[PDB]
């Protein structure tokens, strides 16, 4: 994935727009459960790996079982899965974040619930919404530069 990112973003920037924030969701879980970042944690790493896998399975944009409907799903949520795997790796969450076992299931259950309500709604007049979203920034445009 590190090698794929270098060809998706050739210039080298890192500012992207994505669904539910992850660093803030880790910061919240670090305080709903009084995580003390001073003592050894009790989070088994193979639990992190398999939990992230299972979570990645339940994020369907294109629901289907046959090919050509099982590869478009992998094309849709390609960037978000890379971000999720790089942020919730086993080294980082045993070195920096130091979440407990109880505080990890909460985070997993919240990622999914705040993702499933970002999907578009079937019926919004997307066309007219995108026509005045570009026309009013045409008003800020300078007349003759």
């Amino acid at each position: 994935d590190r090698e794929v990112l270098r060809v998706i973003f050739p210039t080298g920037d890192s500012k992207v727009v994505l669904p539910c924030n992850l660093l803030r969701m880790i910061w919240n879980a670090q305080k709903i459960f009084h995580i003390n970042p001073r003592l050894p944690s009790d989070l088994h790493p193979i639990k992190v790996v398999e939990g992230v896998k299972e979570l990645s399975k339940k994020l369907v944009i294109v629901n289907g079982d046959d090919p050509l409907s099982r590869q478009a799903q992998e094309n849709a949520t390609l960037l978000f899965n890379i971000h999720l795997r790089s942020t919730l790796c086993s080294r980082r969450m045993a070195e920096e974040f130091r979440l407990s076992g109880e505080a990890f299931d909460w985070l997993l259950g919240e990622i999914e619930s705040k993702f499933n309500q970002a999907i578009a709604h079937p019926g919004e007049m997307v066309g007219a919404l995108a026509a005045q979203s570009l026309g009013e920034p045409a008003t800020q445009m300078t007349l003759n530069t």
Partner: protein, 209 residues
């Protein structure tokens, strides 16, 4: 001059050896990276009063899946091409039993010749190019994404998965540079694969009509 002329003939040749490799023909590996001085030593130092005559440059290739269907490419000698001159080629195809043929027109063609190629529809399909257009591979440009042509078994999987017809797809006319680079006929579906910043990868389809 001839140094400009020995350069172009090597460049145009290197382009075509990829164009036919994209269409799924069998081209030997070292033919793709044939450097200039190697070309200058094989076919001749100069075409001005030289061994490279714009003939001795023609190429005949066979398909990967089947050794019978073959493709030919011709390099006419006159700046603009007449009538029997292509029938000279039409005869050369008639004798060798090859239907896929290309002609690398030098500077132009005649309106009468334009009539003379659209007639043999069910047999002896020829593609007309220009010397200038083949000087650069547009497929390796920055803006141009990656196209792939889908078999007629895959196309019936889309229209049954997304429960579509074939009229409801986005369209592309068979006259733009990439529709001809791949040799596409009406009724085919081409697949575009481009990377985007919100998802990472997005696959769209086009109907060539």
């Amino acid at each position: 001059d001839d140094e400009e002329e020995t350069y172009r003939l090597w460049k145009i040749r290197k382009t075509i050896m990829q164009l036919c490799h994209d269409r799924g023909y069998l081209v030997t590996q070292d033919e793709l990276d044939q450097t200039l001085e190697e070309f200058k030593a094989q076919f001749g130092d100069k075409p001005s009063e030289g061994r490279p005559r714009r003939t001795d440059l023609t190429v005949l290739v066979a398909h990967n899946d089947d050794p019978t269907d073959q493709m030919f490419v011709f390099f006419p000698e006159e700046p603009k091409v007449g009538i029997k001159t292509i029938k000279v080629y039409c005869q050369r195809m008639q004798e060798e039993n090859i239907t896929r043929a290309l002609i690398v027109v030098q500077q132009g063609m005649t309106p009468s010749a334009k009539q003379s190629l659209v007639d043999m529809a069910p047999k002896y399909i020829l593609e007309q190019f220009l010397q200038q257009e083949l000087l650069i591979n547009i497929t390796e440009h920055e803006l141009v994404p990656e196209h792939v042509v889908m078999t007629k078994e895959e196309v019936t999987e889309l229209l049954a998965r997304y429960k579509l017809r074939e009229n409801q797809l986005p369209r592309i006319q068979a006259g733009d540079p990439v529709a001809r680079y791949f040799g596409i006929k009406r009724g085919q579906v081409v697949k575009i694969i481009r990377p985007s910043e919100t998802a990472g990868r997005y696959i769209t389809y086009r109907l060539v009509q």
